[PDB]
Design a binder for this molecule. Structure first.
Ligand SMILES: *[C@@H]1O[C@H](CO)[C@@H](O[C@@H]2O[C@H](CO)[C@@H](O[C@@H]3O[C@H](CO[C@H]4O[C@H](CO)[C@@H](O)[C@H](O)[C@@H]4O)[C@@H](O)[C@H](O[C@H]4O[C@H](CO)[C@@H](O)[C@H](O)[C@@H]4O)[C@@H]3O)[C@H](O)[C@H]2NC(C)=O)[C@H](O)[C@H]1NC(C)=O
Ligand SMILES: CN(c1nc(-c2ccc(F)cc2)cs1)c1c(CCC(=O)Nc2ccc3[nH]c(=O)oc3c2)nc2ccc(C3CCN(S(C)(=O)=O)CC3)nn12
Ligand SMILES: [Ca+2]
Ligand SMILES: [Zn+2]
Ligand SMILES: [Zn+2]
Length: 778
């Protein structure tokens, strides 16, 4: 029952035999001499000149004997001091076109250097502070920043980074949570976080194992110091082929704790960032000694950032709620509220709403949260949710710490890092910021694994790599469109809707000026019609009795027009579409709460003649009066502003149906609200994809080069309780509301079932990059 020659053994012992592994401390089940033999701390972590060629003393932490390399247990600076070698950092940038591995290595191994609470902005401290990390960055591939997932805590983001899944999917939705099925809670302290029932999806280390690729243990007991964690990875790498793992992971608790006490912008950050760099320099020195510095892919990545947060800035729910003792709260940089006695949600959220002028948080129903934060579809996520403002804190009842994290994931302070250095990674290359949901696939490709189903767009990050074994394919269309001409007659429609002669509603100047990037593919079985007009094209769904999409383009110089007093109630019937597959105004009269608006704006028609097309029944959708305030402003004002700033814009607006908040398209049965006395379904959100030329010196409709997209998914609310100053002019709130519900085109695709950018002069990998972009207005 000893750890003599078992320290950090990969293969597991299991009880009641004593263990010597990385997690043996976390069960208090290590052998008696574990701390003596495995946490050996004698004679420091660096070789010295006098130590060179020593006789192996097994009490020393690392070794400077010549037999050390054959056990992979040297100090990292062994060959630097003793032999004539140099530190890795003190060497020029040499490109790694091919992997240069020693004998036995079949694939290039992957080490994942994780750094907890490593804010993106820390990378600006530069070579003088972080010389090792700096080399990795500027020598390999790096992003300005990598975007975490909400709620930008550790366990959600590190497991998202492990699985490629949104927290809601894999189930680890916070550092602490409650599961009503289990009837138990998860905590960052305890042995409960080790129970496998909590952990869903499939992490990288299980994917690898299932495909016969051995994995080093990603988990490190806190008792194990950082110098030892590196040495253990380096010992494992020294093993024989049948034993040596291919995928590794290091975990630093820093620079999180430091940030929590001295803030992100403290000058006390320099020392904890210097030790992080030491740890990296140790790894990279240690790899060079094994001739692995031109063989190993090294990923340097963080979980989240850090923000300035003092105690003085804390909202208390006892000063908003009167029945405080009834509720349980998950506090801090976010809020999740729940009933104690297994109380009324409607009252709580109401009481938390726009109560004080300088209110530093906002209540939400999980489904009403911004869709970009895919934080709803899980029984662990509470109905009532609080989005707390940055720099701020929420408690239930009433200065040690000066920093914290956990806020909205588009917050600038919450942004973290990514660096790639290896044979497979691009040399001296810089890439756009990306989401951590994506890296699972890259890490899978780096190891030649088939990724498990996840929420990364697999082609999104091919530009990180010099070579990839995954060429993405644009999906096959399921439903072909009908192209109906004028079939029915004006007199044949009775819809309860009041209000030239030609070859009307035909192509030409329509599909070229308003579909600038090709017709969206549907990707699901449904009958729908293409409808041509002067100012817009649409994909009219015969099932929902409204467009799936409405594509149209506004030039920079395009002018705005007012809707007259006549043509205010005007809802014209569409002769191309049958009465059977059309809406009626009678339903909207029955429905006192519901009204209607238009997908294509009559505000931006070309001529007064063409404005009549904007009033077609095929262009009309169910809208609450409350939402019409939002939508009308967008259409009448903002589209023109965007068109002016961006030298024209292509707009693809449409309805979304998500009544089970799973972020995916609703089936017919899943729909809940129809308009009174009809089967016209009420949308939950309204999207728009506003595309233009990144080269703004060219018009949006004459763009040769890359595209530039800005999108959103506005919630179709019967009120503007969300927007606190909604009592004011729309010029004061509406645009902020839109910016809060920004979206990736990809997010809209999931929800609509549609597929955009089917016809471009652009590579498909680049289009996937464009579709995973998120506009942050930061
Ligand atoms: C992020 O990515 C994840 C992973 O892909 C998505 O989650 C999956 O969503 C799909 C679609 O709803 C789910 O599909 C269903 O899986 C069932 C099998 O379940 C078992 O296996 C999965 C995978 O290992 C386990 O996760 C799960 O616990 C079970 O053990 C099937 O029986 C279902 O059958 C369906 O068949 C056809 C369609 O193919 C239709 O008749 C029906 O749709 C029918 O349900 C179905 O395929 C899947 O289970 C989810 N989990 C996983 C891990 O795959 C997220 O939706 C996605 N988030 C985004 C992008 O918003
Ligand atoms: C989630 N997680 C870890 N993920 C990685 C990782 C994942 C993907 C990568 F690509 C690279 C690395 C390493 S460890 C974790 C941790 C983190 C350690 C910790 O104590 N967290 C922590 C520490 C300080 C702070 N401060 C703060 O504000 O938040 C903090 C968080 N403790 C653990 C423990 C257990 C697990 C489980 C074990 C079971 N397995 S399983 C079922 O797949 O076998 C899942 C992971 N992860 N587990
Ligand atoms: Ca849905
Ligand atoms: Zn963390
Ligand atoms: Zn933290």
């Amino acid at each position: 029952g000893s750890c003599k020659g078992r320290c950090f053994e990969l293969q597991e012992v299991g009880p009641p035999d004593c263990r010597c592994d990385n997690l043996c401390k976390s069960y208090s089940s290590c052998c008696h001499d574990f701390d003596e033999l495995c946490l050996k701390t004698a004679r420091g972590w660096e070789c010295t000149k006098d130590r060179c060629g020593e006789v192996r003393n097994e009490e020393n932490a690392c070794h400077c004997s010549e037999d050390c390399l054959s056990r992979g247990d040297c100090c990292t600076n062994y060959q630097v001091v003793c032999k004539g070698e140099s530190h890795w950092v003190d060497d020029d940038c040499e490109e790694i076109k091919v992997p240069e591995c020693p004998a036995g290595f079949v694939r290039p191994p992957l080490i994942i250097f994780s750094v907890d609470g490593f804010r993106a902005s820390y990378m600006k401290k530069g070579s003088k502070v972080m010389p090792n990390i700096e080399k990795l960055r500027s020598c390999g591939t790096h992003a300005p920043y990598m975007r975490p997932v909400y709620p930008t805590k550790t366990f959600p983001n590190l497991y998202t980074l492990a699985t490629g899944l949104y927290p809601e999917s894999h189930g680890i939705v916070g550092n602490s949570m409650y599961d009503p099925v289990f009837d138990a809670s998860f905590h960052l302290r305890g042995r409960e976080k080790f129970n496998h029932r909590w952990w869903g999806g499939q992490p990288l280390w299980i994917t690898a194992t299932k495909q016969g690729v051995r994995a080093g243990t990603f988990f490190w007991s806190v008792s194990i110091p950082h110098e030892r964690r590196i040495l253990t990875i380096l010992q494992w790498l020294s093993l024989p082929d049948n034993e040596r793992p291919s995928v590794y992971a290091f975990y630093s608790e820093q620079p999180d704790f430091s940030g929590h006490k001295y803030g992100p912008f403290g000058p006390e950050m320099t020392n904890p960032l210097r030790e992080i760099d030491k740890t990296v320099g140790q790894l990279m020195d240690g790899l060079k000694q094994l001739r692995l510095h031109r063989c190993v892919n090294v990923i340097f990545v963080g979980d989240h950032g850090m923000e300035d947060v003092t105690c003085d800035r804390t909202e208390f729910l006892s000063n908003y709620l009167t029945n405080v003792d009834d509720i349980t709260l998950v506090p801090g940089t976010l809020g999740r509220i729940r009933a104690k006695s297994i109380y009324d949600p409607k009252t709580i959220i109401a009481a938390l709403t726009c109560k004080k002028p300088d209110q530093h948080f906002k209540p939400y129903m999980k489904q009403h949260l911004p869709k970009r934060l895919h934080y709803a579809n899980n029984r662990r996520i509470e109905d009532i949710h609080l989005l707390v403002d940055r720099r701020w804190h929420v408690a239930r009842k009433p200065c040690f710490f000066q920093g914290d994290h956990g806020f909205d994931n588009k917050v600038n302070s919450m942004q973290t890092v990514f660096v790639g250095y290896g044979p497979t990674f691009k040399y001296r290359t810089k890439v756009p910021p990306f989401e951590n949901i994506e890296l699972y696939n890259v890490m899978c490709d780096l190891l030649g694994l088939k990724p498990a189903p996840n929420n990364g767009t697999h082609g999104s990050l091919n530009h990180l790599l010099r070579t990839n074994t995954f060429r993405p394919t644009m999906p096959d269309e399921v439903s072909r469109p009908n192209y109906p001409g004028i079939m029915y007659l004006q007199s044949e429609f009775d819809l309860g809707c009041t209000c030239l002669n030609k070859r009307l509603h035909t192509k030409g100047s329509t599909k070229e000026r308003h579909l600038l990037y090709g017709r969206p593919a549907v990707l699901y079985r449904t009958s729908y019609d293409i409808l041509y007009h002067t100012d817009f094209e649409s994909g009219y769904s015969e099932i929902f009795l409204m467009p799936l999409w409405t594509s149209y383009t506004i030039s920079k110089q395009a002018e705005v027009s007012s809707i007259p007093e006549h043509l205010t109630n005007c809802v014209r019937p569409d002769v191309r579409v049958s009465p059977g597959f059309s809406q009626n105004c009678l339903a909207y009269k029955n429905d006192k709460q519901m009204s209607y608006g238009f997908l294509f704006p009559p505000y931006l028609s070309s001529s007064p003649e063409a404005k009549y097309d904007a009033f077609l029944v095929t262009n009309m959708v169910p809208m609450y009066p409350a939402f019409k305030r939002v939508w009308a402003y967008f259409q009448r004002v903002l589209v023109k502003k965007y068109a002016s700033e961006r030298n024209g814009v292509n707009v693809i607006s449409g309805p979304i149906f998500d009544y089970n908040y799973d972020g995916l398209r609703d089936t017919e049965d899943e729909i809940k609200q129809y308009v009174e006395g009809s089967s016209i379904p009420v949308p939950t959100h309204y999207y728009s994809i506003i595309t233009s030329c990144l080269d703004f010196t060219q018009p949006a409709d004459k763009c040769d080069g890359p595209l530039s997209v800005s999108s959103f998914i506005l919630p179709h609310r019967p009120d503007n309780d969300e927007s606190c100053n909604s009592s004011e002019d729309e010029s004061k709130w509406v645009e902020e509301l839109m910016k809060m519900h920004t979206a990736r085109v990809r997010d809209i695709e999931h929800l609509t079932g549609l597929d955009f950018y089917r016809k471009t002069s652009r590579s498909y990998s680049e289009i996937l990059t464009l579709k995973t972009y998120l506009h942050t207005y930061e």
